[PDB]
Structures are given as structure tokens and as C-alpha cells.
Design a protein around this motif. Structure first.
Motif, PDB file in Angstrom:
ATOM      1  N   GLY A 182       0.754  -1.100   0.054  1.00  0.00           N
ATOM      2  CA  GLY A 182       0.102  -0.085   0.041  1.00  0.00           C
ATOM      3  C   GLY A 182       0.796   1.155  -0.094  1.00  0.00           C
ATOM      4  N   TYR A 183       0.168   2.221  -0.110  1.00  0.00           N
ATOM      5  CA  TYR A 183       0.802   3.688  -0.069  1.00  0.00           C
ATOM      6  C   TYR A 183       1.207   4.014   1.334  1.00  0.00           C
ATOM      7  N   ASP A 184       1.051   3.229   2.202  1.00  0.00           N
ATOM      8  CA  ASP A 184       1.383   3.555   3.650  1.00  0.00           C
ATOM      9  C   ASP A 184       3.098   3.304   3.733  1.00  0.00           C
ATOM     10  N   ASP A 185       3.425   2.356   2.955  1.00  0.00           N
ATOM     11  CA  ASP A 185       5.028   1.966   2.756  1.00  0.00           C
ATOM     12  C   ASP A 185       5.602   2.977   2.154  1.00  0.00           C
ATOM     13  N   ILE A 186       4.685   4.183   1.443  1.00  0.00           N
ATOM     14  CA  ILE A 186       5.540   5.113   0.564  1.00  0.00           C
ATOM     15  C   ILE A 186       5.840   6.371   1.252  1.00  0.00           C
ATOM     16  N   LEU A 222       9.333  11.620 -15.089  1.00  0.00           N
ATOM     17  CA  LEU A 222      10.549  10.546 -14.729  1.00  0.00           C
ATOM     18  C   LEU A 222      10.717  10.618 -13.378  1.00  0.00           C
ATOM     19  N   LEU A 223      11.076   9.585 -12.785  1.00  0.00           N
ATOM     20  CA  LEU A 223      10.875   9.106 -11.273  1.00  0.00           C
ATOM     21  C   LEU A 223      12.323   9.637 -10.758  1.00  0.00           C
ATOM     22  N   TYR A 224      12.324   9.799  -9.321  1.00  0.00           N
ATOM     23  CA  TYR A 224      13.640  10.182  -8.458  1.00  0.00           C
ATOM     24  C   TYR A 224      14.594   9.172  -8.668  1.00  0.00           C
ATOM     25  N   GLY A 225      15.783   9.607  -8.701  1.00  0.00           N
ATOM     26  CA  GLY A 225      16.856   8.534  -8.431  1.00  0.00           C
ATOM     27  C   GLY A 225      17.316   8.025  -7.344  1.00  0.00           C
ATOM     28  N   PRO A 226      16.857   6.817  -6.795  1.00  0.00           N
ATOM     29  CA  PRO A 226      17.097   6.517  -5.554  1.00  0.00           C
ATOM     30  C   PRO A 226      18.539   5.839  -5.408  1.00  0.00           C
ATOM     31  N   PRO A 227      19.408   6.150  -4.276  1.00  0.00           N
ATOM     32  CA  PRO A 227      20.621   5.545  -4.195  1.00  0.00           C
ATOM     33  C   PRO A 227      20.513   4.154  -3.319  1.00  0.00           C
ATOM     34  N   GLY A 228      20.109   3.262  -3.793  1.00  0.00           N
ATOM     35  CA  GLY A 228      20.124   1.963  -3.648  1.00  0.00           C
ATOM     36  C   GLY A 228      19.206   1.632  -2.366  1.00  0.00           C
ATOM     37  N   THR A 229      18.355   2.545  -1.944  1.00  0.00           N
ATOM     38  CA  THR A 229      17.544   2.168  -0.729  1.00  0.00           C
ATOM     39  C   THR A 229      16.287   0.940  -1.179  1.00  0.00           C
ATOM     40  N   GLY A 230      16.399   0.790  -2.641  1.00  0.00           N
ATOM     41  CA  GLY A 230      15.496   0.075  -3.282  1.00  0.00           C
ATOM     42  C   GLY A 230      14.207   0.753  -3.512  1.00  0.00           C
ATOM     43  N   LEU A 233      10.358  -0.744  -3.920  1.00  0.00           N
ATOM     44  CA  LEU A 233       9.192  -0.687  -2.988  1.00  0.00           C
ATOM     45  C   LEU A 233       8.491   0.509  -3.244  1.00  0.00           C
ATOM     46  N   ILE A 234       8.879   1.672  -3.648  1.00  0.00           N
ATOM     47  CA  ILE A 234       7.776   2.845  -4.174  1.00  0.00           C
ATOM     48  C   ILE A 234       7.279   2.426  -5.365  1.00  0.00           C
ATOM     49  N   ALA A 235       7.984   1.841  -6.412  1.00  0.00           N
ATOM     50  CA  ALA A 235       7.138   1.408  -7.553  1.00  0.00           C
ATOM     51  C   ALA A 235       5.962   0.511  -7.250  1.00  0.00           C
ATOM     52  CB  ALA A 235       8.314   0.937  -8.532  1.00  0.00           C
ATOM     53  N   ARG A 236       6.208  -0.307  -6.564  1.00  0.00           N
ATOM     54  CA  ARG A 236       5.130  -1.556  -6.312  1.00  0.00           C
ATOM     55  C   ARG A 236       4.126  -0.872  -5.354  1.00  0.00           C
TER      56      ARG A 236
END
Lengths: 245, 86, 135
Positions: A182-186, A222-230, A233-236
Motif C-alpha cells: 500500500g501507499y502507507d509504505d511510501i 521521470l522518477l527520482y533517482g534512489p541511492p540503492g535504498t530500493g 518498494l516505491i514502484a510496487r
């Protein structure tokens, strides 16, 4: 943050049996104790239940089915524009989903017995995806269809016995579906991610507004560049929160 | 739809749901008996007049066997009450 | 306008790209006094020098034959667009394969204001402000 959002607290029952719709709720909206209510639920939780109006015991704020809301991941306080859902009418023989977890504990052909108890005067909330108290064969027979696009519940003649699915639905699939992203993890990026998600949603929820802005809507984001945090998670979480392929 | 409707008396918008789901909403005064509601249904609908029309709610099942009950004791104000013809 | 994408003709089958290119050229010729809308043509050939790919070499040769060819382009313009002029092939950069060549430059602040106003013509996001002033 909407007028159609009463302060939905947990009902006196975790199911929709002891809901307490406010006197203002029963007044401003046609919120009867025994009326079909097309309320709002999160993660595409279509609520068409009949929430009780226990304003007589306490004309407090809205009281919502705790178990049903938790199973449907509903927001206790959301703008539940609970309207009649008589338009959604079920077919005579619909693919009713008999769950194996529902039969995991039920004795004999308790599915037929519960269906007889459920076909006419089901005595439970008329919806899908929530936790409805279903007792049959001394067990919790939640052998319900996951959802029906028209009338997820029996909105047809009480004798219109939907053709139950032969295969029993195992509990593992149900657990996997319930443990959705869910969007809660976001959280965290409640500024940048929130802005991007709002940009996507408004384009989907109010594209007319973007067109009427006079300026053309953004062609994409275009989505943010995450520094390896994964970022998976956000995409799902977004994909689950979004009705797009 | 011969229902005792009066502004001074306590009117209740009884959303009388039909067997097909047609919520016949009538603002009947509380002094009107269940006989008045049955007469209103019969006048507004001959399908229930020719059959044993007893108002039974879906949750829970309680047929309107006593037609002498006043609208005040019925407690069907702003309620979607199902109606069936038998 | 025979629009031609870059990674379009290159297919798995043998000689599929060259056959597709020849078919497109013939269709444009028989269609009208058409213009070869060669879109994203920049990544088509490394001057056949760095072209270690035999399929790529064959594609470059077929392209040269179609473009650089006697009585090949009759009323047939070639809308060639380049993103990396350095990446241009040797033969194409010459006249005969591409007789004309233009480079698109960045706009000046006056041209910037003109283009900005033209783009903003769809809306009114400042009634009391001049877009030329900001530009």
C-alpha cells in the motif's frame, strides 16, 4: 478533509452489525441502519454494506466495522460517500468463489448450508473484500466471491444462487493478496514522492482540470533517482495504489 | 399513494424498498397506522394489493403482520425498508 | 511523408532491413513526389569504418546504394535528422548521399522570448506579467 468524511471510529462490533451512524450522518446522507451504503474504502475496497445507525445508543461520530475495515484496509474516517447501491445487481448464476480456507474447518457440505443461510437473509454486510462474520459448519465459511464488478454481493433475487466455483481457494493466495504494498509504505518522501504521485493521480483523477488549466498537462514524470535504498518498494506501492497496467 | 401526510404531525421519509429494489420513499405522518401505509402501497401499486403484502425488512426478517401499528412505532424513518408481495 | 524510425528496419531475418528499406523507397517513389522523413537517422552507420557488424555494414551499403545511386531520387527528398553530427557516416556527410546538411543551434534570448510566448499562447498564467520580460 472532506464534508462527506465523518469521523468514522471503530463500530461497537468489528463487523458491520453494531455500526453507529451519527444523527447528522443519518440526516445529511440517507444513512439508515438497514440501507445499502456505497461507502469508500482504500486499496479499491468497494463497500456496499448496510451499516447500522446506532445514534440512539450514542449519537457520536461514525462507527465503522473494525474487522471489515481492517480486512478491506479501509480508512476509519475517510470520505465514505455511502450511497445506495441498488444499481449494482448480481446475476442469477455468478462465479461464487468457494475458498479452501473457508472450508478449512467447515464440516461436510456446510457450503450449501451457509449458502441457504446466505442466499436469503444473509444477515451480513453486502460487499466484498472485507471481514464479514460468516458462520457455517461450526466454522468461518468465508467462501465468498472475491468481488463481482456488478453487485459484489447478492443484489438479485434471494433464490438467485450464484454458480459456486468448483475449485477451493487456498489461504496462501489470500494471504499474499492481503499483504499488498500500500501507499502507507511510501512514506518519508512526503514531499517529492507525494508531489510525483499527486501529479500522476490528478492526471488520472482530474485530467479535465489539467486540460482546463489552459496549459497542456505534463506528458509524464521521470522518477527520482534512489541511492540503492530500493526503489522497487516505491514502484510496487504506486502500482498497487494505481489502476494502470 | 394514500398515505396520511401532515406537516404538523411527525412525518418520516420511509424509503419503502420494493421487491425489485424500488425505494418508494413516502413522508408519512407518525399518526398514520401501518394500515395507512399498506393502503398507500396498494393505491400506488396494485401488484402488492392483489398479493399478501407484508412489509418485511431484509436485516432482520420481520413481516408487517400487525397492520394496526402506528408509523411512530414502526421506526422506518429515512430507512430503506424492503417490501414484498406474497 | 515516409516517416522512418531509426531502429525500425533492423530485424532478425536475413536481409530484412535492406529489403524493408528498398520497399519503403519504392513505395515512396510510386506514391508521390514524397520526402523521405528519415527520423532519428543519426544512429544508422559509423561511417562503415568502425562498423564491425557485418549486418550493420550491409545496412550501410544498402543505404548508400539507395541514397547515393544514379537516377535514384527523382522528386524524392530525404528528411535526414541528426542528433550527433560527429557520428555522421563518411559517405552520407558528402553531397550525393546527402547533398544538403543543416545544424540546429540554440535560440537567442529574443528567439527565446518568441518561442516562449508562442508556447505560452495556449494559456494565461500571468495576466499582469509579460513573458518577454521574464524571457
Amino acid at each position: 478533509n472532506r464534508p462527506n468524511r465523518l469521523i468514522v471510529d471503530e463500530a461497537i462490533n468489528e463487523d458491520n452489525s453494531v455500526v453507529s451512524l451519527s444523527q447528522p450522518k443519518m440526516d445529511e446522507l440517507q444513512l439508515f441502519r438497514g440501507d445499502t451504503v456505497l461507502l469508500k474504502g482504500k486499496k479499491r475496497r468497494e463497500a456496499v454494506c448496510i451499516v447500522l445507525s446506532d445514534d440512539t445508543c450514542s449519537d457520536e461520530k461514525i462507527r465503522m466495522n473494525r474487522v471489515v475495515r481492517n480486512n478491506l484496509r479501509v480508512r476509519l474516517g475517510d470520505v465514505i460517500s455511502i450511497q445506495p447501491c441498488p444499481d449494482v445487481k448480481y446475476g442469477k448464476r455468478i462465479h461464487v468463489l468457494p475458498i479452501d480456507d473457508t472450508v478449512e474447518g467447515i464440516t461436510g457440505n456446510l457450503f450449501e448450508v451457509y449458502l441457504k443461510p446466505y442466499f436469503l437473509e444473509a444477515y451480513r454486510p453486502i460487499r466484498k473484500g472485507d471481514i464479514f462474520l460468516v458462520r457455517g459448519g461450526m466454522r468461518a465459511v468465508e467462501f465468498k466471491v472475491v468481488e463481482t464488478d456488478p453487485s459484489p454481493y447478492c443484489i438479485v433475487a434471494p433464490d438467485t444462487v450464484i454458480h459456486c466455483e468448483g475449485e477451493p481457494i487456498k489461504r496462501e493466495d489470500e494471504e499474499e493478496s492481503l499483504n499488498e504494498v500500500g501507499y502507507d509504505d511510501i512514506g518519508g518522501c512526503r514531499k517529492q514522492l507525494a508531489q510525483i504521485k499527486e501529479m500522476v493521480e490528478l492526471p488520472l483523477r482530474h485530467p479535465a482540470l489539467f486540460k482546463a488549466i489552459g496549459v497542456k498537462p505534463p506528458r509524464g514524470i521521470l522518477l527520482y533517482g534512489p541511492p540503492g535504498t530500493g526503489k522497487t518498494l516505491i514502484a510496487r506501492a504506486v502500482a498497487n495504489e494505481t489502476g494502470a497496467f | 399513494a394514500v398515505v396520511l401526510i401532515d406537516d404538523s404531525v411527525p412525518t418520516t421519509k420511509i424509503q419503502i424498498r420494493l421487491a425489485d429494489g424500488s425505494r418508494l420513499i413516502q413522508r408519512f405522518n407518525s399518526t398514520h397506522r401501518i394500515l395507512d401505509v399498506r393502503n398507500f402501497i396498494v393505491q400506488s401499486r396494485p401488484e402488492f394489493a392483489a398479493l399478501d403484502f407484508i412489509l418485511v425488512t431484509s436485516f432482520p426478517n420481520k413481516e408487517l403482520t400487525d397492520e394496526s401499528l402506528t408509523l411512530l412505532e414502526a421506526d422506518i424513518l429515512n430507512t430503506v425498508l424492503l417490501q414484498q408481495l406474497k | 511523408f515516409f516517416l522512418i524510425n531509426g531502429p525500425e528496419i533492423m530485424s532478425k531475418l536475413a536481409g530484412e532491413s535492406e529489403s524493408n528499406l528498398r520497399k519503403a523507397f519504392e513505395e515512396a517513389e510510386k506514391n508521390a513526389p514524397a520526402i523521405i522523413f528519415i527520423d532519428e537517422l543519426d544512429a544508422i552507420a559509423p561511417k562503415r569504418e568502425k562498423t564491425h557488424g557485418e549486418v550493420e555494414r550491409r545496412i550501410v551499403s544498402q543505404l548508400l546504394t539507395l541514397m547515393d545511386g544514379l537516377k535514384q531520387r527523382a522528386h524524392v527528398i530525404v528528411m535526414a535528422a541528426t542528433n550527433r553530427p560527429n557520428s555522421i557516416d563518411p559517405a552520407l556527410r558528402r553531397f550525393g548521399r546527402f547533398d544538403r546538411e543543416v545544424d540546429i543551434g540554440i535560440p537567442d534570448a529574443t528567439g527565446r522570448l518568441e518561442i516562449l510566448q508562442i508556447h505560452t499562447k495556449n494559456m494565461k498564467l500571468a495576466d499582469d506579467v509579460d513573458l518577454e520580460q521574464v524571457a
